[PDB]
Design a protein around this ligand. Structure first.
Ligand SMILES: O=S(=O)(O)c1cc(S(=O)(=O)O)c2ccc3c(S(=O)(=O)O)cc(S(=O)(=O)O)c4ccc1c2c43
Ligand SMILES: O=S(=O)(O)c1cc(S(=O)(=O)O)c2ccc3c(S(=O)(=O)O)cc(S(=O)(=O)O)c4ccc1c2c43
Lengths: 492, 492, 492, 492
């Protein structure tokens, strides 16, 4: 009924008084300082992503410290995400630093280490040791962000494949390689990830964006890598090839959330198919009640120009229409010229798309898929959201300690803000990747367990009033405990 | 969707574990004694009806006292209803008390008082002074359960009517005269009624069944006759002629419920139209959320025979399928030979019908008629009944002091028992006219104010446990303060 | 949504311009003559039932001849039904013609033939030879329309059961017996049925009401009994005990329709359960698209009184509310005092109930149960009926040779008349047991095959105009071929 | 329910066997020759667009002739569209042709004609005489794709405006000046347009893409300029500014379809609001049952690069998800380097998106918006599409001379191909702007009038067979005469 809803809109009408979608910003040279982080917060950042593909621990420690200091000064809670380098397949080095590959030529790719330092156009190293048992004649090998394509012809021997060069491209040392038709069986985490995951645990990071996740079992290996002290850290799986797409259900089941990495998927999969995989993965997460992030190539052209292209604008709005909880900036904020303006524009686009989006369609499609009998939690949250639509309540207040009930309510897509009142700061930070929720910390050790829930409910209603969401005479729907209890409150 | 539900039924499956419909019994000489009342209660009586058309205040006082004593000895709460004589048009006296009226033969009816004694087969008497100025040229005067018809030709004078006798009836003193195309404008209540109603209030009756209600304003007259001390007594309007049916919407709005008096309706409305009027009135009260009683000609042949006719049984079951809260016995218990057996048989027909009735169709049809936005009470009660269906809960517990919210929940027809926990014994008795509710009295003088609700909630739950409605690991939906809080509780 | 529909009705509104339900009348002494059949036709009979439990072939031949002659004179098509005697279990004879059975007494029921002529209260014959292998100790034996109840105690020997008499009742010779807890395994048809079925085939009867149908296999035995020349005769199965109820699905599947024989069911099954089995069997037939007849004890009291009881009126309306195609009169027309008036009253009751009945509920419940993909026939008829609701068309015209497409359209319950145009008179007669259809004979041998369907469609539209169903500017929905073709016609 | 459909998809399943969306290509010097046009057709072009902003009548005549010749050699019918230059506000001439405008610096714009030649950086010229009396104190004058902004301060005189230059732009001769808060009241069509439109009619173009439509009355002006001989030519209104968007309902009602000109909208509406305007306009046309085209900035970067950006691909796919009938290429085919490849890639994105799009949501959303009662045509076409879903039919055949009913069927979005069988070659070409229809020309001069429809029906069915849409035992839904007859045919 989005179609029926479009009929009634006018683009000269006011936008909503709140933005539900959440903006993740990658921190780098343009943005690491406390003042630049403050600008990013004020522009609309909810999450600071650290790309551990680059920078040492010391560099990321400065990110960590500066985010906390910026957030403390503005009086907000900002989530910190550790995005891992992950396992990789790269070529070796070449004699003269470079290899000119020509359409029609035959070359040999080998996994023998002796060729690591001495590659040429005719024969060169690929560091993936299982390369030969996982490829068949006919498969393609992509190298250099998929620009050079080789076709496998035969096994020259146990370690060496004879390949045709399908297209001309010059490659330099240590380029990335992809196998679009094969199951890559590299481990879940690299040796470097293990070191980086431990550091992320020691430094209190909120979530991991775990690279190259291919199967459900690898999620548990990331979890083991985080150790017992890391058990509350969220694992968001980055879906980057066909195996991740194919195994999405069981991956979603084990993960705490999903990243749709469109540019990585796009190396292996036609761009038109990635548009469609983005729709599927996002709807499956919406149905699982798990946050989903739309990432890479979002307003890329605004890295160096003051304005993005019109197609990039439609990409960002369409991620919100698809159902994304979050939209993500990489080089635009890490190294770009206009970090503040890009985040501000991203927020505006999201806000505009949300004003057009019919939330009732998400609520109703999601509710119709529940199997009866529902459990108590599910019944209470979907009813509570139903009660919002039925009374036209203007806010929800959900008391949640771990954040579970807040995410379960957000899953059902009310058409008003959700204020989560929690007794854990780390819940305030982790809910920054859930659309449509804002969190209020209630310090139980300072103020009391509030067993009767009245102080926490008042803290929620007060926050909603300070934002203009509710006034005297409006309804607010309250949920508390996971969450088996609801009230419809008349606001004073 | 009753249709789809019918497909799945087997008459060899066991019946539901609770009976939702309520049985009202008229007390008379067969049934007035404490032992006979106890037999009525154990057989299924929830309400004792006093018919104030017969007997003295002292006689009704004894019914009151004995009902209270029988209920006390059984530990139950039984409602007491006062059914008013109401206004009437009595013919006067005749020659020796008789005449024979025949077809063709000319008759003259009088509004003049001197002819109160001296009547004939020619010219006689009627005490309704508005007779001539209401009855038009050609209308019908029924006199005696509608069995004698007379046709008003012309006004012989101001206080006389010139009449065809249109059939052969042999009548006798002081008759039920019936003016069917005629809007009878006798007042709401007679002098007897005003005196009887005051007695009712003095004696603490739970409800009035107010005879012959024709318009909404007449409901006000009953309420004023009940006065300041009668403000908590329910008024159930007895719909007995075409005007009450025409005016049904405004009558329901002013009243606390309706009795459909099929026999009386039938004096001037063809029987097949009364069957439909019954459907309309029941559905309008189901939507109003007010109790509705199906009365007269229920299991009549069981007054003197040990079993009813097959068409009588279907009448009672269809009353339940139509949506009645209550079915009522008149002579069958007041002066019949099988009072226990007729009540037990009524209870068994009700329970059989209920096991075939799809409550969900009721819930859904009613919910769909709700105006959006809903008020908080409406939204909370529909949602709680919705949650019963979604979680297949096995009981509801409703905290309700006045009974209002118990009735609001019952309106939506959950497919499990409702347990009202109440602090007023009069709410326990008054809810006896609401299908699908059992009330648990919580003695606040003797047990405290239970500000936390927890003692009342547990009393509710324990009652449900003692009846076998719920056991360990079942769900129960709990509602309370109007009613703006809901919980879905796992039974311990 | 019957409940929502009740809210909008008024009993002073005009009834529909057509009666959809069909009245079956049993012919006897009060009604066998041509003038009395003419009166019955004019009063509303569509079907003349012959009860072959009584009368010889010669008697029924007069019924057959007189129905045809009455129908020819009035210019209508009347269906003729042969209702079989069927297999029976009876007691033998008693010494002195009579046996006084007393609560508490022991008696012996035996299947040894030697006792056929010499029964007494202590020991007597029951002609069902498998009696002893089919009963267990604890079972009941009903005798004399279920008035006398025996309980089986033990097997006295291979042929004799020792029984307690549970209640006092005097029985006379050759009384009927029932076994409520046992599977009766008598053959489908008696020796007498076979002779009567052959006669019915020779005389061109339209349908058989086949007595005591217990399982699906017995329907095929009735069919074999009718022989190759009887293959177009409809078999309507009379459902009279628990086995028929239990096996209803597979019976419906093989039968051409169902009779719900409430009084026979009521011998074995509590009357409250029979109310419910009537609902189930009728809805299952509505879903199967097969006619269903509500029979026995319909307005029984109007056999000797000029008016029926109010409960009997509600029984007839409630059969139409349940979904019956037909309602049936037995002694009321066969031997009663008021045959014309009873049929007229039955028609009026049906008409009144139909005016209140929400046909859209039947259409929508039935449509939602179809499995997708539907076959072409089903899709065309349900769409055609949907198109009636959508355009508010005022009639349907369905060209059907065998009557199959007309019954498939009637199954979907349009809210307008259906005019079936058929090239077989016997289809005109057989459709008399399908609600909501009237048939027009088109003699193809006289007028042409009408391959372009225009003359048959005009014959339908003309009939609809002559009845007042449609006028200039109204829509009429036309279906033709079973039936894979639809048009929405503007009436000229 | 798009949401539920997303859950079931796999990007590794095969694509649909037909592409429903239609591809429009702008002809220019890369593409004008018969061979290049043939390459366009085989690559997926259904419509040749002539941009009458450039080139002479002789030049467009050659496009016309070559399109017809290329289509004839391939045996297909291709639509020809004339896109009008439309009215404009050109700045005049300058000093040497240039100036540099900077921030702060004062500028004076003139409506006086003597300054047509002699302009400066100070004071220059604009040919829109209503300039001063439309533009208010403080409004914006954009001049050059919106890149130069100027702010109107006050009226320096009657025919002059006193202006802040609010940025640094260095402009040049005869510019696209843009008055964004301004309701531009230039007439509907210029003199060039009236001359070009008459040429269009003489040359038998199928449709007009009418530039810069702002109001409904303006549609009349186009139609009058087309005159009596142009009455069958479709008018597609190009929506290019805020007024066309404000007035969208009445414009659609008067027009035969809409083009959403994103680039032009974007001059005065922020890009994120144009994304939403696109959603609104497409849905309003889907409900109107009129073709809607998504145009400008489609795969722009593919004008000179061998591949588009990833955000461009998503733009095209989302155009299809929004519901567009047609996507349009401008410079990409008019002067680009890869005209064949851009069309083939467009076709592949369209087909990918379609395989993910749930047509049923469209069908259902549209059906629900229909007013009851429906007219016969509406009811027949929705029902026929409903029958496709119910029987999982694999094709529709629609007989439609003018194309009206083909478009009415397409509106309801069956999930199978529609084959229109038509007697007019111009209906074959005009339906090229309606998604999901292929047209089969039935030559009535050469083949007869087919009064029985049977030859046209079989031509439809055979075409569907030759494309592999249906084989033996599939269903096909056939609709014909407006369209008031339907058949569900089993394929032989
Ligand atoms: O390969 S090493 O760099 O020596 C290395 C060091 C450590 S460490 O001592 O804990 O730091 C590892 C800890 C845990 C590992 C697990 S597990 O999740 O703990 O079960 C699985 C695999 S596997 O390679 O996928 O089979 C591991 C491979 C290599 C590991 C470790 C693995
Ligand atoms: O028992 S008799 O009276 O001698 C007698 C006479 C004839 S008749 O020659 O055709 O008239 C029978 C014809 C067909 C019969 C069939 S069947 O449907 O044809 O298969 C079944 C049974 S059964 O008893 O259920 O096994 C029959 C029982 C007794 C029959 C006939 C039966």
């Amino acid at each position: 009924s989005q179609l029926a809803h479009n009929l009634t809109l006018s683009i000269f009408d006011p936008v909503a008084n709140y933005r539900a979608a959440r903006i993740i910003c990658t921190i780098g040279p343009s943005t690491q300082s406390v003042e630049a982080l403050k600008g990013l917060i004020q522009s609309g950042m909810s999450v600071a992503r650290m790309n551990f593909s680059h920078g040492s621990h010391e560099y990321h420690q400065t990110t960590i410290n500066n985010v906390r200091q910026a957030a403390a000064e503005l009086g907000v809670n900002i989530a910190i995400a550790l995005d891992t380098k992950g396992p990789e397949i790269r070529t070796g080095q070449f004699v003269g630093g470079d290899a000119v590959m020509e359409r029609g030529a035959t070359c040999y790719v080998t996994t023998d280490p002796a060729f690591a330092d001495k590659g040429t156009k005719d024969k060169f190293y690929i560091d993936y040791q299982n390369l030969s048992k996982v490829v068949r004649p006919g498969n393609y090998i992509y190298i250099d962000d998929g620009i050079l394509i080789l076709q496998v012809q035969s096994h020259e021997d146990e370690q060496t494949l004879e390949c045709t060069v399908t297209n001309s491209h010059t490659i330099s040392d240590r380029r990335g390689v992809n196998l679009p038709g094969c199951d890559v069986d590299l481990p879940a985490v690299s040796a470097k990830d293990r070191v980086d995951l431990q550091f992320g645990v020691e430094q209190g990071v909120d979530m991991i964006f775990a690279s190259f996740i291919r199967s459900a079992e690898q999620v548990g290996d990331v979890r083991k890598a985080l150790g017992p002290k890391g058990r509350d850290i969220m694992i968001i799986c980055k879906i980057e090839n066909h195996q991740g797409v194919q195994n999405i259900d069981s991956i979603i089941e084990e993960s705490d959330g999903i990243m749709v990495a469109r540019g990585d998927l796009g190396v292996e999969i036609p761009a038109e198919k990635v548009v469609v995989a983005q729709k599927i993965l996002i709807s499956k997460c919406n149905v699982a009640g798990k946050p989903v992030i739309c990432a890479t190539q979002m307003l890329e052209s605004m890295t160096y120009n003051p304005r993005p292209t019109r197609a990039e604008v439609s990409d960002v709005a369409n991620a919100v229409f698809n159902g994304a909880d979050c939209v993500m900036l990489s080089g635009e904020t890490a190294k770009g010229k206009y970090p503040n303006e890009v985040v501000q524009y991203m927020a505006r686009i999201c806000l505009e798309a949300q004003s057009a989006l019919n939330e009732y369609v998400f609520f109703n499609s999601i509710k119709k898929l529940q199997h009866i009998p529902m459990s108590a939690d599910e019944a209470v949250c979907s009813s509570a959201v139903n009660s919002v639509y039925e009374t036209k309540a203007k806010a929800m207040v959900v008391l949640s300690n771990t954040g579970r009930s807040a995410r379960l309510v957000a899953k059902y897509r009310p058409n008003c803000p959700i204020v989560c009142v929690t007794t854990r700061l780390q819940t305030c930070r982790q809910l920054n990747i859930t659309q449509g929720v804002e969190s209020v910390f209630f310090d139980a050790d300072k103020l009391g367990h509030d067993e009767g829930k009245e102080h926490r409910v008042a803290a929620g209603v007060e926050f909603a009033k300070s934002k203009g969401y509710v006034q005297t005479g409006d309804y607010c729907v309250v949920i508390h405990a996971y969450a088996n209890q609801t009230r419809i409150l008349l606001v004073e």
